[PDB]
Design a binder for this molecule. Structure first.
Ligand SMILES: [Br-]
Ligand SMILES: [Br-]
Ligand SMILES: [Br-]
Ligand SMILES: [Br-]
Ligand SMILES: [Br-]
Ligand SMILES: [Br-]
Ligand SMILES: [Br-]
Ligand SMILES: [Br-]
Ligand SMILES: [Br-]
Ligand SMILES: [Br-]
Ligand SMILES: [Br-]
Ligand SMILES: [Br-]
Lengths: 411, 399
């Protein structure tokens, strides 16, 4: 009687669980955690401590359900500048439990039974189960390499063909997790034109918006002609400020679209943590004062990461993988398949080769990455099997340890 | 094309979205939503600052999806003592964004299309729209006064009549919001017996578990014979430690039932805030060392609140209302009638004209039964004494 309801049938644990257990068992040099292994900007940490210690007793009591006022004010001040439109802080911004819950409120609020939703593989892992749980029908299309993340592209004919009147939503993720692909203007117009043609909602997951490397540029699809009225754009304080344990994010867009998200949110979590939102608001006000200065965190994070990106691409090419150099973000996918005659995966029991390889590497060599086949639909999982995802948001000494491990191993 | 999906059709802003806005607009003395207007235990606030300031770079990054290990360990340690069983911290506890998301995970996780769910009126208002979003069919029965919250009782015959082959779940809330009713053992046994007869899951919303007044006692339904296997119990750090802005709660119960909640949670928020869970774990470890002490916050909150409860019942009775004196919690319902739906118009009038905000209890009834709440008002008395005095004086002069 108490089995999962239909909309959840065949739910399983995320890939993260077994990889966290694997890391605890073997204690590898861990390049699988998508978060830094050093500390976030001190102004932000100090702001959380100040909110805990606040002399205002209301600092740690309930705040406004759709978002703490100081925070939605700051979010509107920033994004209004970026999108060149004044965004209403009360009706056109919704604060959520991470970008994760902004995706959840968006998909539950706008996907009904039978609605088709286009998802681009490799997908952020929640897109498929959230669409399924809403009674939607996912329609998958993969990015495939033609190297740079710019070389991983969609087949436009395939994409055009997937859209029709039953398409309710497309989810795009730029910069992309985990490729680092930054959609260029032409790629954004491809999506925007199909969305206008078919009257589709575009949900743009832009959590890595501040982490684009020179000479690329983050462009927001909501600014394209006719897109404001049919786009919901999503960001994350965890990704903006490198504080993934804070779990606060947001959706912004027209009030008409945000109403559906508000109905979901108000009877899912109702409201989000007050002192965390206060600290994040302080973080935004700090950056708003120096937005054009190089020490703004929004501007400095890319140069901080680029040296690390380059160092990883170099050591991975040296051991004989072929890395896809990302245009943004802190993940790198590499093709390990030329090492396959140099590794013994015969005692690895998983169905897909990149699980076998990543588990073998943790156990044998003490270096942990993540299997990108986890981010494909079952019929396209073969496209992930030659690859591995690493994170380079790591202390230099740990990147150097990873390099040493691979040097030793090749020797 | 972009209307609400069917499962949300007819949705409107909740009483809380509406009333928080009214409060921001008119800046009344706010005796509405339950929270204290004074500082929570220092040890908890200190622990949050310590987590913000931690030298451990993992303290502010993602933690375990089903709950931060230090917190679920503390929760198992406390609740294993209270329920007289070893609760598995990894499989029988789930941490959530408040008791709100624990209710959400529970209802989504165990209510499928056409399952009937029994809700007891007046109900904490999220129960109904959560059932409806899951495709469930709510069935309602009201508590009615026969004063004390003990005097608000259901008809047992009407309750039994609600149980049938389609009943999947009954939600109980004790101590109760808004009445402060504390279910006694006989009342718990009525529900337990019917759940066992009809193979129904009991969801017990126990956020106010530590706020029972003498001479009453909180009893956990999951301890009744045969009830462990079919109960999910919910709590809240916001209510346990008087830190409502922290929004961390939990469900506990048998592994078989908790699996469903894990799947919904995983695909909803994934994980909850790390430093907040760390601070709450420190708070539980602090209290676990002194469980029978008068200084233990689980023990002291009732004494603190009781004087405030009695002060409010006295001033409400003095102005001509008839209060229901709660057996636990920090809310009081009173019948204002000797002075769209009437109680909405009353609470709104009071906020705007005399600057004193309460809550309309018709928000906690099904549409057909809203008339049962129209003559009442809900006030929160978890406030500094100077502000309870201010309410007394606002009402005295309004009279
Ligand atoms: Br885990
Ligand atoms: Br990991
Ligand atoms: Br700083
Ligand atoms: Br272009
Ligand atoms: Br264009
Ligand atoms: Br750069
Ligand atoms: Br537009
Ligand atoms: Br209120
Ligand atoms: Br996890
Ligand atoms: Br409803
Ligand atoms: Br007492
Ligand atoms: Br049992």
């Amino acid at each position: 009687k108490f089995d999962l309801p239909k909309r959840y049938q065949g739910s399983t644990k995320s890939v993260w669980v077994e990889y966290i257990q694997l890391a605890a068992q073997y204690k590898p040099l861990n390049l699988g955690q998508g978060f830094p292994d050093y500390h976030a900007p001190k102004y932000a940490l100090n702001a959380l401590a100040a909110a805990a210690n606040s002399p205002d007793p209301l600092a740690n009591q309930y705040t406004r359900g759709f978002g703490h006022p100081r925070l939605v004010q700051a979010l509107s001040k920033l994004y209004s500048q970026l999108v060149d439109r004044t965004i209403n802080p009360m009706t056109e911004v919704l604060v959520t439990v991470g970008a994760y819950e902004a995706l959840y409120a968006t998909i539950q609020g706008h996907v009904d039974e039978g609605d088709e939703v286009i998802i681009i593989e490799p997908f952020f892992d929640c897109y498929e189960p959230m669409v399924k749980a809403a009674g939607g029908i996912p329609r998958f299309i993969p990015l495939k390499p033609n190297i740079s993340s710019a070389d991983w592209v969609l087949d436009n004919n395939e994409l055009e063909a997937l859209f029709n009147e039953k398409t309710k939503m497309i989810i795009i993720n730029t910069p992309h997790n985990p490729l680092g692909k930054v959609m260029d203007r032409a790629e954004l117009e491809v999506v925007a034109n199909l969305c206008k043609k078919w009257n589709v909602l575009c949900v743009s997951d832009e959590v890595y918006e501040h982490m684009v490397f020179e000479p690329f540029e983050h462009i927001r699809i909501c600014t394209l002609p006719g897109m404001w009225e049919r786009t919901i754009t999503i960001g994350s304080a965890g990704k903006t400020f490198s504080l993934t344990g804070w779990k606060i994010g947001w959706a912004y867009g027209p009030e008409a679209l945000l109403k559906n998200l508000q109905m979901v949110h108000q009877n899912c979590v109702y409201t989000c943590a007050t002192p965390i939102q206060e600290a994040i608001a302080v973080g935004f006000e700090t950056e708003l004062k120096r937005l054009k200065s190089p020490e703004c965190y929004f501007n400095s994070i890319s140069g901080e990461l680029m040296a690390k990106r380059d160092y990883m691409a170099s050591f991975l090419a040296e051991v004989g993988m072929n890395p896809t150099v990302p245009q943004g973000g802190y993940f790198m996918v590499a093709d390990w398949s030329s090492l396959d005659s140099k590794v013994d995966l015969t005692q690895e029991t998983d169905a897909r080769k990149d699980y076998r390889f990543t588990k073998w590497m943790t156990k044998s060599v003490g270096l942990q990455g993540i299997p990108p086949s986890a981010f494909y639909s079952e019929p396209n999982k073969h496209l992930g099997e030659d690859f591995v995802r690493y994170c380079f948001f790591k202390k230099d000494e740990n990147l150097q340890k990873a390099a040493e491990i691979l040097r030793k191993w090749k020797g």
